[PDB]
Structure 1
Amino acid sequence: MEAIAKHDFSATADDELSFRKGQILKILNMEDDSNWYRAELDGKEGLIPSNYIEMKNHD
């Protein structure tokens, strides 16, 4: 349910979000299990590129 940005990301679509390396993005919906994901940042929802993040949660 928690993830961290391994790199920088800028939305490539209207329904997308953005994030920077080291930040903690909240997962809410991963879609249909493919290339675009959905998280919450600063109380905002939007999709993200799956290849730019990595499942976190804890050690």
Structure 2
Amino acid sequence: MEAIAKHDFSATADDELSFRKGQILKILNMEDDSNWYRAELDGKEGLIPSNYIEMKNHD
């Protein structure tokens, strides 16, 4: 699916992804279903926190 950054996030270990409020993060990982997920932004993929991605558009 698609998501949006509610707050700012700066990566610590491995390959995490940084983001800021108002930003649009893409959800395209697998079926882990947990706290770490894989996203895509500006043609780049990575891992982000599920609680750090909100929802927008649609409605």
TM interval, short-chain normalised: 0.7 to 0.9
**Stretches of structure 1 lacking an aligned partner (at least 5 in a row):** none
TM-score, normalisation: structure 2: 0.82
Q: Which has the larger strand fraction?
A: 1
**Stretches of structure 2 lacking an aligned partner (at least 5 in a row):** none
1:3 to partner: Cα distance? 0.5
Structure possessing the higher radius of gyration over alpha carbons? 2
Matched residues, number: 59
TM-score, normalisation: structure 1: 0.82
Distance 1:34 1:55 in 2: 17
Percent identity between the aligned chains?
A: 100
For CA contacts below 8 A with separation 6 or more, give which structure has more relative contact order. Answer: 1
Deviation beyond 2 Å, 4+ runs, structure 1:
none
Q: Is the 8 A contact 1:2 1:57 kept in 2?
A: no
Alpha carbon RMSD of aligned pairs, Å? Answer: 1.6
